[PDB]
């Protein structure tokens, strides 16, 4: 019984620790795709505004 | 200065949006540091819940 | 020649601002929809470690 | 100068279509990307209910 | 009580990323307003100089 | 100097949105130090079933 | 109760920073309205004596 | 024997529902990246046209 009680005591503490770590580790991999696409849509929209 | 203004409006707007994207990156990097605060905390405490 | 300039460049600038509005709305929606990714695509695959 | 403006007008009209190519693929992407941020917020809330 | 404290931790982490993304969208509107405002100040100055 | 004044004002206003979005995320680190105290409430709960 | 105290603090602090960023947006427009009014008025005064 | 058969049941059907959500994440981040890749392949040459 205690083997499966120690199983949650890994499972719960692991899902809580992995949530709050991978929030920053993957948010800082979406922020860099925003860097790559703002360097496209700057290069589109500003080039209509430079024509007006 | 009229010729310059045609790049200067784009340089201003790109350097504005690249600052503003670094500013949305820095608030989201402090979100990676909050999610690291939870990761060091669940590492310290939830590991000792599993020792508990 | 310069009267052909004034009447040509300004009906083009009317058609160009009829597109510059779409390119400002997509560039505004990039910044927002990437802020949506910064939370949602971190949570998504992080919570698949926990789906297991 | 008039050859350069007959050119800048034909350029204005060409390059508005060459931006309409990019900004129509970004406009289709932006509409599908509002639909995707609902698909990834569905992934956040679904997989976070499954984390609970 | 530890399982409830782990479900409210997922609600905290999800709602943090959701309001961090809405804040990052408001900062993205603030930055796009700047890059339009930098054009409006330059268009006003170019117009007034051209007239005088 | 007015195109330059429109630039550094936008970059400073974007930095003002950083400094107040960072503080609302410093007020989020003050919650991750409570997700710590909840992971220590799981240590104290596994220590309650230990002691009992 | 410390995890739930971290929920309400993060949400209220981040909603406060959203109102602060939307005021930073309004102050950028309320400044730009004066920067264009000064660019119109100052160069109208420089050209008034020159035209006169 | 029950705990061994139960642990093999859990590890089996874990991978069954893990996989299908992990195939959805790896599609959700691809839908975005593939629509961005379509624009990025036209946008190579048009950005040198725009500036000419």
Nearest-Cα distance to chain F for E42, in Å, is 6
> Do residues B21 and F15 touch, judged by C-beta distance below 8 A?
no
- Interface A-E, measured as beta-carbon pairs within 8 A, has a size of 15
The greatest distance separating any two alpha carbons of chain D, rounded to the nearest whole angstrom, comes to 70
* E39, G34 Cβ separation under 8 angstroms: no
Cα–Cα distances in angstroms (integers) from residue E31 to residues D27, F18, H32, in the given order: 20, 11, 23
Nearest CA in chain E to B20: E31
3-state secondary structure D1-52: CHHHHHHHHHHHHHHHHHHHHHHHHHHHHHHHHHHHHHHHHHHHHHHHHHHC
Chains near E (3 or more Cβ pairs under 8 Å): A, B, C, D, F, G
Q: What's the CA gap between H34 and E24, in Å, rounded?
A: 24
The closest alpha carbon to D13, from C12, A48, A47, C20, belongs to C12
A&C contacts, CB < 8 Å: 69
All residues of chain E having their beta carbon less than 8 Å from the beta carbon of residue F11 are 34
Q: CB distance B39–A12 less than 8 Å?
A: no
Query: Residues with Cβ < 8 Å from C49, sequence gap 6 or more?
Result: A15, A18, A22
DSSP letter for B52, please.
-
Select the residue of D21, D22, D39 nearest H28 (Cβ to Cβ): D39
Question: With a CB-CB cutoff of 8 Å, which residues 1-52 of chain E face chain A?
Answer: 2-3, 6, 9-10, 13, 17, 35, 39
CA F25, F28, F33, F38 torsion-angle sign: negative
Burial readout C40-51 (b: 16 or more C-beta within 10 A, e: otherwise): bbbbbbbbbbbb
What chain B residue is nearest to F47 in terms of C-alpha separation? B52
Resolution in A: 7.2
| Residue G4 C-beta-side C-alpha neighbours within 13 Å | 7
A26 inside 8 A of chain H by CB: no
Q: Does C have 3 or more CB contacts under 8 Å with A? A: yes
Judged on CB neighbours under 10 Å (0-12, 13-18, 19+), B2 is exposed
Q: Does D20 touch chain C (CB under 8 A)?
A: yes
Burial label, F33 (beta-carbon count in 10 A; 0-12, 13-18, 19+): middle
Residue A2 at interface with chain D, using a CB cutoff of 8 Å:
no
């Amino acid at each position: 019984l205690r083997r499966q009680v120690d199983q949650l005591t890994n499972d719960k503490a692991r899902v809580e620790v992995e949530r709050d770590n991978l929030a920053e580790d993957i948010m800082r991999l979406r922020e860099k795709l925003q860097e790559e696409m703002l360097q496209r849509e700057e290069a589109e929209n500003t080039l209509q505004s430079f024509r007006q | 200065a009229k010729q310059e203004s045609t790049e200067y409006r784009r340089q201003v707007q790109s350097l504005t949006c690249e600052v503003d994207a670094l500013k949305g990156t820095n608030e989201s990097l402090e979100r990676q540091m909050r999610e690291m605060e939870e990761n060091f905390a669940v590492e310290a405490a939830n590991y000792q819940d599993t020792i508990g």
